[PDB]
Ligand binder design. Structure first.
Ligand SMILES: NC1=NC(=O)C2=N[C@H]3C(S)=C(S)[C@@H](COP(=O)(O)OP(=O)(O)OC[C@H]4O[C@@H](n5cnc6c(=O)[nH]c(N)nc65)[C@H](O)[C@@H]4O)O[C@H]3NC2=N1
Ligand SMILES: NC1=NC(=O)C2=N[C@H]3C(S)=C(S)[C@@H](COP(=O)(O)OP(=O)(O)OC[C@H]4O[C@@H](n5cnc6c(=O)[nH]c(N)nc65)[C@H](O)[C@@H]4O)O[C@H]3NC2=N1
Length: 778
C-alpha cells in the first residue's frame, strides 16, 4: 500500500501518506486555515508503544471472577486471551449482571470524547448493545458545561452553551471591545467534537486586523493574550462573580446601566438589586469589596464597567469558571451583567459562550444535517424501571457517589431520586481514570464494581484498571462519514480507511455486534447492514434533505470518490444571537416561564437549594486562593491541555515536547518557586489532603502569583495500587481535585476548585510505567 488517503479527526481534516501499508505522515487539509500541531501525535497514536495489541483479562478476575481481590486493579497483571474467549466472557458477564441485578446493575454512561464518525460512534454503539441486553444506567450532562448547561435554560430559556454565536464577521464590523472571560480560544479552538474547521482563527485574525480592543480575564497569560497583545486582567481563580458584582454595582452607583433594557427584556432585577446594594446583608457589592476578594484593583473594576457600558462590547466567556463549586453562578451573573449593559441582541454586543469551542461563530452554511447510528432506544419498549430500583440516569460527575451509595437519595435540578445499585461498568471511548475528580476516592469506589470492561486503542490508566480490555481500532483503520464544523456545517467528509487494523484490534462496531450476536440479538444490532451500508444510509438521508432544501448533492459513490461535499453560505455570516428577541420580545419570547431573561428565578426559588439561590449570588466555595481559613496556599489552574485533547496523545511523541524530567509540567511563578527553594526544571511534589502527585516545574511569570498551572489529562501512574494515597508518578491533576457537586441545581463537577502545596520532591526515585504496555500485552 503506497499512496495518499484523506480522512479527519477531532483535530481536523488531513491527508495521510501510506508507504507499504504504514501511515508515515499526516498533512493538513489545504483548506484548513490553522492546522493543529497535534496531528503528528494523532498519527503516532496508531503505532506508539501504548497501542493496545490484544484482548486481555486481568489475571485475578480471569481466575476468580466476582470473588477477585479488586484492590489490585491497575497493577498491570493481565493475561492475553483470544477474541472468542474474551467475547464469550463479556457476553456472559453482561447477561449475568442483567439477569441478576436488572438494567440498574449496569452503568452505560461511558462518558468520553472518543473519535468523530457517524458509524463508529463507540459510546452510542455500546448503548445500542446494552439496550438489546436489557437496558442500563445512563449519564446526563457532561464535564464541560455541567453547571452552565443547566442554569442557562432557567435564565435564558435555552441550552446556550452549544448554540451558534453571533458570526465572527459581524463582530469584526461592529464590536469595539471583545472580552475573553475565562476563555483561551487560541488554545481550545484546535479541536472539534465533529471535524473542526478551525473557523475561530480567521475570526480572531479579523478582530486583530480591525484593531478592536481586546481584554482577557484569566489567571494565566495565555496565547490568546499574546496573540492580541490584550489588556490582561488576572483575577484570583474562583472570584469572577465578585468582580462581575463589583462591575454591576458600579453601573448602578454611577447611574449608567441600561434601565430600559432591564425593564423591557428581564425579569426579577428588582429582587436582585437590594442584594447588590447590600440591603439584605449589610455588604454592598462595591468595586472595593470585589477587590478584597479577587485582588483586581477596585478602580480597574470600575473602569472596565464604564468601558463595557460605553462601547459595543461582546463578553465571550469560557467554561473553566463554571467547572467549579457554585459554577452555576458564573454564567448566570455574566448574563445579568450583560443585561445591565443592554446590548444583548445588537450586532457585536452581548455575550457568547461558545467562541472558544468547536468554531462557535463560524458562519453556518445552508447544508443539511448528518445523523449516524442510534442506540435503538426509540425502537422496542424498554421494560419498567421503578423508582425503588433507583434512577435510570445520573449527572455524569456523580458516578462515584452512585457507586458508594446505592439506594441513597440525590437532588438534581428540582428532582430527588435514588442511586441505582450498579455492579458493572462498561467504558468505551473515555478515560475516567484521568477525567474524574478525586482519584484516590474513585480508586477505592471502583472496588464496588464486580466487573469493569474497557475498549480503547491506547493503554490509558482506565484500560490499565479494567478487568477485561478489548483492543479497539482507531478511525484510521476503518471507513466513516462525518460533518466538518459543529456549527459551520462546512461540508461532509468521507473518513477513509488509511491502514488495515493493527495487531488484533477490532472496531467497536465489530466487537459490539459480536457480543450482541452472542446475546441472541446480532441481527438487531447490525440491522442487516455492513460498514458501507450504514454509511450510505446516513449520506442518502443527508442528500434527501439537501435535495429538498435546494442544496442537491452527488450520489453516494460519486461523493465517496471525491471524498467530501462542501456547502454554500447563504445568510449564515449575518447571524446575530438574540436579535429576534431584542427586535420584538413579545413576538419572539425566550423559553423561560416569563418569556424574559430571568435574573431572579421563581422556579429555582421553589427548589430551596442552599447552594443555588434564586438570583446570582457570591457564595464562598469549598476552598479558594487566600480564602479565610483556606489550608493550602496555591490555586491549581487545572485547565485543558495545549498539546493533548484531554488525555489523548499523552502516550505519543508529543509528550517529549512538554514533559519536565519525564513528568507532566507545572507552571509556577518565580516568587512562589523561590520561596520553596524550587529551581526551573526541578521535580516537585504537588499535594493536598486528597492526594499527591509529581510534576516537573517550569518557572514563569505567565502564571499569576499564587497560581500554578497543571493541565488536566495526565496519565495517572500510581506507584503502588494497593497503597491508599499512593504517589502518582506522572501527574494526573485529578488526584488533587475534590469530587463534589457545583450545587444541587446541576451537580456539575468542580475539577478546577483546587488548592494545593508544592515542595521540591525528596521521596524515593520513580520509574514511569504508564508509557509502555503492561508486560503481558507487549
Ligand atoms: N481537573 C479537571 N479539569 C478539567 O478542566 C477537566 N475537563 C473535563 C472535561 S470538559 C472532559 S470532556 C473530560 C475528558 O475526559 P475524556 O474521558 O472524554 O478524555 P479523552 O483523553 O478524550 O478519552 C477518550 C478516550 O477514548 C479513546 N478512543 C478514541 N476513539 C476511540 C474509539 O473509536 N473507540 C474506543 N474504544 N476508544 C476510543 C481515546 O484513545 C481516549 O483514551 O475531562 C474532564 N476532566 C477535567 N478535570
Ligand atoms: N487543545 C485543546 N485541548 C483540549 O483538551 C480541549 N478540550 C475541549 C473541551 S471538551 C472543551 S469543554 C474546551 C474547554 O474550554 P474551557 O473555556 O473550559 O477551557 P479551560 O482550558 O478549562 O479554561 C480556559 C481558561 O480559563 C482560565 N481560568 C481558570 N480558572 C479561572 C477563573 O477562576 N477565572 C477566570 N477568569 N479564568 C480562569 C484558564 O487559565 C484557561 O486559560 O476546550 C476544548 N478544546 C480543547 N483544546
Amino acid at each position: 500500500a503506497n499512496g495518499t488517503v484523506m480522512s479527519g479527526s477531532h483535530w481536523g481534516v488531513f491527508t495521510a501518506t501510506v508507504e507499504n501499508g504504514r501511515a508515515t505522515a499526516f498533512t493538513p487539509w489545504e483548506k484548513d486555515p490553522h492546522p493543529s500541531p497535534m496531528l503528528a501525535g494523532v498519527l503516532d497514536s496508531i503505532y506508539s508503544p501504548t497501542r493496545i495489541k490484544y484482548p486481555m483479562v486481568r489475571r485475578e478476575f480471569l481466575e476468580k471472577g466476582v470473588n477477585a481481590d479488586r484492590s489490585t486493579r491497575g497493577n498491570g497483571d493481565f493475561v492475553r486471551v483470544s477474541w472468542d474467549q474474551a467475547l464469550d466472557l463479556v457476553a456472559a458477564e453482561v447477561k449475568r449482571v442483567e439477569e441478576t441485578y436488572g438494567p440498574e446493575g449496569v452503568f452505560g454512561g461511558s462518558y468520553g470524547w472518543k473519535s468523530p464518525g457517524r458509524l463508529h460512534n463507540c459510546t452510542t454503539l455500546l448503548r445500542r448493545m446494552l439496550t438489546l441486553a436489557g437496558g442500563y444506567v445512563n449519564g446526563a450532562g457532561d464535564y464541560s458545561t455541567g453547571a452552565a448547561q443547566v442554569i442557562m435554560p432557567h435564565v435564558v430559556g435555552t441550552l446556550e452553551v452549544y448554540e451558534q454565536q453571533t458570526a465572527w464577521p459581524v463582530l469584526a464590523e461592529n464590536t469595539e471591545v471583545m472580552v475573553f472571560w475565562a476563555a483561551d480560544p487560541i488554545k481550545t479552538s484546535q479541536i472539534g467534537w465533529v471535524i473542526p474547521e478551525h473557523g475561530a482563527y480567521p475570526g480572531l485574525e479579523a478582530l486583530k486586523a480591525k484593531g478592536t480592543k481586546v481584554i482577557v480575564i484569566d489567571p494565566v497569560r495565555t496565547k490568546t493574550v499574546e496573540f492580541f497583545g490584550a489588556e490582561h486582567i488576572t483575577p484570583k481563580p474562583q472570584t469572577d462573580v465578585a468582580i462581575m458584582l463589583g462591575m454591576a454595582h458600579t453601573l448602578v452607583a454611577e447611574d449608567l446601566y441600561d434601565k430600559d433594557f432591564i425593564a423591557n427584556y428581564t425579569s426579577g432585577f428588582d429582587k436582585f438589586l437590594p442584594y447588590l446594594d447590600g440591603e439584605t446583608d449589610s455588604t454592598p457589592k462595591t468595586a472595593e469589596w470585589a477587590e478584597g476578594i479577587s485582588g483586581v484593583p477596585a478602580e480597574t473594576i470600575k473602569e472596565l464597567a464604564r468601558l463595557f457600558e460605553s462601547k459595543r462590547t461582546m463578553l465571550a466567556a469560557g467554561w473553566s469558571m463554571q467547572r467549579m463549586h457554585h459554577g452555576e453562578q458564573a454564567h448566570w451573573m455574566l448574563v445579568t451583567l450583560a443585561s445591565m449593559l443592554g446590548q444583548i441582541g445588537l450586532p457585536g454586543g452581548g455575550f457568547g459562550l461558545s467562541y472558544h469551542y468547536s468554531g462557535g461563530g463560524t458562519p453556518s452554511t445552508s447544508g443539511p444535517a448528518l445523523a449516524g447510528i442510534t442506540d435503538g432506544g426509540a425502537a422496542t419498549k424498554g421494560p419498567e424501571w421503578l423508582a425503588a430500583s433507583g434512577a435510570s440516569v445520573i449527572p455524569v460527575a456523580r458516578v462515584v457517589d452512585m457507586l458508594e451509595n446505592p439506594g441513597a437519595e440525590f437532588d438534581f435540578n428540582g428532582t430527588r431520586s435514588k442511586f441505582p445499585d450498579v455492579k458493572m461498568a462498561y467504558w468505551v471511548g473515555g478515560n475516567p481514570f484521568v477525567h474524574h475528580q478525586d482519584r484516590n476516592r474513585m480508586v477505592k469506589a471502583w472496588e464496588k464494581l464486580e466487573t469493569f470492561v474497557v475498549h480503547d486503542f491506547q493503554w490509558t490508566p482506565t484500560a490499565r484498571h479494567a478487568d477485561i480490555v478489548l483492543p479497539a481500532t482507531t478511525s484510521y483503520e476503518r471507513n466513516d462519514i462525518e460533518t466538518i464544523g459543529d456549527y459551520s456545517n462546512t461540508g461532509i467528509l468521507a473518513m477513509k480507511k488509511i491502514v488495515e487494523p493493527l495487531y488484533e484490534a477490532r472496531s467497536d462496531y465489530d466487537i459490539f455486534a459480536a457480543v450482541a450476536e452472542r446475546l441472541g440479538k446480532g441481527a438487531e444490532f447490525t440491522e442487516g447492514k455492513d460498514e458501507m451500508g450504514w454509511i450510505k444510509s446516513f449520506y442518502d438521508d443527508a442528500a434527501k434533505q439537501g435535495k429538498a432544501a435546494g442544496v442537491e448533492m452527488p450520489a453516494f459513490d460519486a461523493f465517496w470518490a471525491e471524498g467530501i461535499v462542501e456547502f454554500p453560505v447563504t445568510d449564515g455570516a449575518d447571524f446575530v444571537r438574540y436579535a429576534s428577541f431584542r427586535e420584538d420580545p413579545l413576538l419572539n419570547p425566550l423559553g423561560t416561564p416569563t418569556g424574559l431573561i430571568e435574573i431572579y428565578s421563581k422556579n429555582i426559588e421553589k427548589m430551596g437549594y442552599d447552594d443555588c439561590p434564586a438570583h446570582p449570588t457570591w457564595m464562598e466555595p469549598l476552598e479558594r486562593l487566600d480564602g479565610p481559613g483556606a489550608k493550602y496556599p496555591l490555586h491549581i489552574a487545572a485547565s485543558h491541555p495545549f498539546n493533548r485533547l484531554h488525555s489523548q496523545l499523552n502516550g505519543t511523541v508529543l509528550r517529549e515536547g512538554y514533559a519536565v524530567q519525564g513528568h507532566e509540567p507545572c507552571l509556577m511563578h518565580p516568587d512562589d518557586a523561590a520561596a520553596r527553594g524550587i529551581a526551573d526544571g526541578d521535580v516537585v511534589r504537588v499535594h493536598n489532603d486528597r492526594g499527591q502527585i509529581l510534576t516537573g516545574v517550569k518557572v514563569t511569570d505567565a502564571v499569576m502569583k499564587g497560581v500554578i498551572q497543571i493541565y488536566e489529562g495526565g496519565w495517572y501512574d500510581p506507584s503502588d495500587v494497593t497503597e491508599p494515597g499512593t504517589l502518582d508518578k506522572y501527574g494526573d491533576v485529578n488526584v488533587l481535585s475534590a469530587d463534589i457537586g457545583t450545587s444541587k441545581l446541576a451537580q456539575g463537577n468542580c475539577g478546577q476548585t483546587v488548592l494545593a502545596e508544592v515542595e521540591k520532591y525528596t521521596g524515593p526515585a520513580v520509574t514511569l510505567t504508564g508509557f509502555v504496555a503492561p508486560k503481558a500485552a507487549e
